[model samples]
Target: NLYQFKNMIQCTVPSRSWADFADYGCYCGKGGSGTPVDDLDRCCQTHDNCYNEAENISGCRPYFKTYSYECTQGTLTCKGDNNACAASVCDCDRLAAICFAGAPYNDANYNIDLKARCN
Candidate 1:
């Protein structure tokens, strides 16, 4: 927080920067008043930029790095066995199940969201 005192108002108050504001989702990066911004992607990107900068200043990278390390250690053991399936659309659930069996202890953090990518 920044403190500034000046003029006859004669008070100390916390000054702020653009990054101090919260992400407005689709309403970010534009004037806070009037019609909300329509560009969702742009708004999200702005929010991401602000969040990253704040995190950097707060020395959060070490904690995040440690948190990611365990998940990164896990592997998709069945990925290389993709060729084992005769057809392009084999049993995705089975494949996922097989991969999880051999995944690292932190497999819970590594579940892949097949979502639209698979059926």
Candidate 2:
């Protein structure tokens, strides 16, 4: 949650430079103005110049990593698939479903009206 970012455009049409100017769909946040910016992507937490590469990048997406440990002892298991404990070691849920299934609130934005804003 500690990230912030700015908007940018292609160097060809609009020129590439940093601006305090919030893009539409951008959340300028409050110094408290009540209007929402719809054109800008979400506020990505980064320096303005950090994303000045070839393409436009907006919003800081969540990044995740997996870990493994040697459980010389037995770990947890699933009822249906006894292979769930295969090789005495089970792996993390690599599926996107497990990644987002238990997400709090309505995390999966799919099937919702994409045009709807938080207003």
Model 2: weakest 10-residue lDDT segment is 4-13
In order, how many clashes per candidate? 0, 12
lDDT agreement with native, every candidate: 0.26, 0.23
Q: Across residues 10-71, which tens digit of lDDT does each residue of candidate 2 receive? A: 11112223232222222222221223332122222121122222113233222211122221
What's model 1's overall lDDT? 0.26
Against the true structure, what is each candidate's TM-score? 0.19, 0.17
How well is each residue in 30-85 modelled by candidate 1, as lDDT tens digits? 22223323343233343334444445443443112211101113322223343322
For each of the candidates, the C-alpha root-mean-square deviation to the true structure, in angstroms, is 23.3, 18.3
